Design a protein around this nucleic acid. Sequence first.
RNA 1: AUUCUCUCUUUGCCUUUUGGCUUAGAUCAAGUGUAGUAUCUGUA
RNA 2: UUUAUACUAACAC
Lengths: 44, 145, 48, 305
Amino acid sequence: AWKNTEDEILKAAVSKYGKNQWARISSLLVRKTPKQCKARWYEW
Amino acid sequence: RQGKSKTILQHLSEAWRCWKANIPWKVPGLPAPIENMILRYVKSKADWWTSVAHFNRERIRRGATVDKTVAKKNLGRLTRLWLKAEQERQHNYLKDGPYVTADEAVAIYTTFVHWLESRRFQPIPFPPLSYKHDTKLLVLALERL
Amino acid sequence: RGPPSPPPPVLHSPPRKVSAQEQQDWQIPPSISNWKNPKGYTIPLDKR
Amino acid sequence: XXXXXXXXXXXXXXXXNITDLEELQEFQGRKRKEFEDAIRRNRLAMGHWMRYGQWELDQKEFARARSVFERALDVDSTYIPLWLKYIECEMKNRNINHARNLFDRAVTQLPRVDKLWYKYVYMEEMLGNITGCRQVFERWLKWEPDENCWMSYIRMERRYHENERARGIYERFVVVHPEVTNWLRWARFEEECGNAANVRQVYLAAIDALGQEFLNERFFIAFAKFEIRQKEYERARTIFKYAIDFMPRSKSMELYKEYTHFEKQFXXXXXXXXXXXXXXXXXXXXXXXXXXXXXXXXXXXXXXX
RNA sequence: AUUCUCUCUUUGCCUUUUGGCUUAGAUCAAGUGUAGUAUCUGUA
RNA sequence: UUUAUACUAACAC
């Protein structure tokens, strides 16, 4: 799906941690998985 | 001012990390002196770290070692050391261009055509929408998964 | 342990002139990681 | 809603004594424990040291304070910011004699710490006696530092009188640092002294020590300007005439224009043509038409004269 | 004319970045239900 | 009396 709410936390997440970590971010996104969370980043 | 003494290090490390990953490590304006400091004292590390993945893959080949730790670590250190050099084999294939050379590929293709020609070979079509065998085929696929 | 024998005269050669361009040419940008960024310290994505 | 996901965290986090004589010593004791621990954690780390002393003076003064700076100075001798901090805290309670020893220690212990040297005398002026300042200022000149060591030594001699010592101090500075600016700095003092005879022999002394290779073109005009002060026509001409001969192509043009400036003051427009014609030929001419254009200039200058 | 304080404009200085090192040191969000206690919200 | 959170958890399947 990927709505706005998701992406605007993700952008805040990468600024926080770094693009290297991905499973720290997918915890805070709940329904997203570190493969999608990373994948959807390098696309968009 | 000595506000760099400690500061220089957090590059060094990041440099080292950068190497292991294979990502490049350009850095905005820092002294070309201290760029080298750190390109040099990385290069050292990257020996005594490669060296060892040699020396422990030949205390395992043999038998000596045990406990995952070592057979776990010096499986990592390889997996990097090998990805490093499957990266170069790609980059230095687009830069150095196809190794086949058209004339060679022309022969290989054409000779292949004559073989399929000799057989009276029929090419495999795209699955029909009314195909008796597909249901059978799918189950097999899953059973394998 | 006790305190050392009091120090001696330093007697350096005379301090060389530095200039403001030289002290800027040794400017060291604080490096920032791809991975190890502990604590908080948020950094915008245009500084990466 | 990207920038608002960060700023909303800050505002949310933003919203979220003593009696008796006996009970103060408990409070005062526990702060001593605090400080002593931070020293054990970090042998060196002067922030924790400096602090510790300051804190003791306000409470008590003397031993605890005057030990701790001494104790911390053993860990790093050559930290200037500890040196000073330790000095200031004495004079805030006014014991100068105490400090004047401590000031000497540093001076000796490190001679190329200018910050100590200036600060050594500055205290002296507030303190009083001026004879102390000189003996201090003299033994800084045995290390023979720099102009700004000397000139601060002379501006003691000018603020107060006794202007014969100042002149001899000026002489010493010439011997150690022999360069042109120094020599002309000497003449400054004879200007306020008002001894026109005494000026000339100093200017003469400059020509003795330097020699041909050492003197500037600037030196001779610094001479000339003094002749405009006295308005002597006999000195002026013969200085310029003599001075022009040592510089030629190196520093010519600048000197000629100053010679004419004098002739503007004082039939007698012969050098007006010679200064213009020399400057016309002096104009560089790379090429054929550039040199031929200059040939039209100097030929007209030769024709008229 | 000097010194001190306040206000504005332009410019300088930093603390190492939260101690270091490894196989990114390592793995992946089905828990729910009841009982008791504490806090908060509403009913001249 | 209802709702949420934590503590009870030195619980149970």
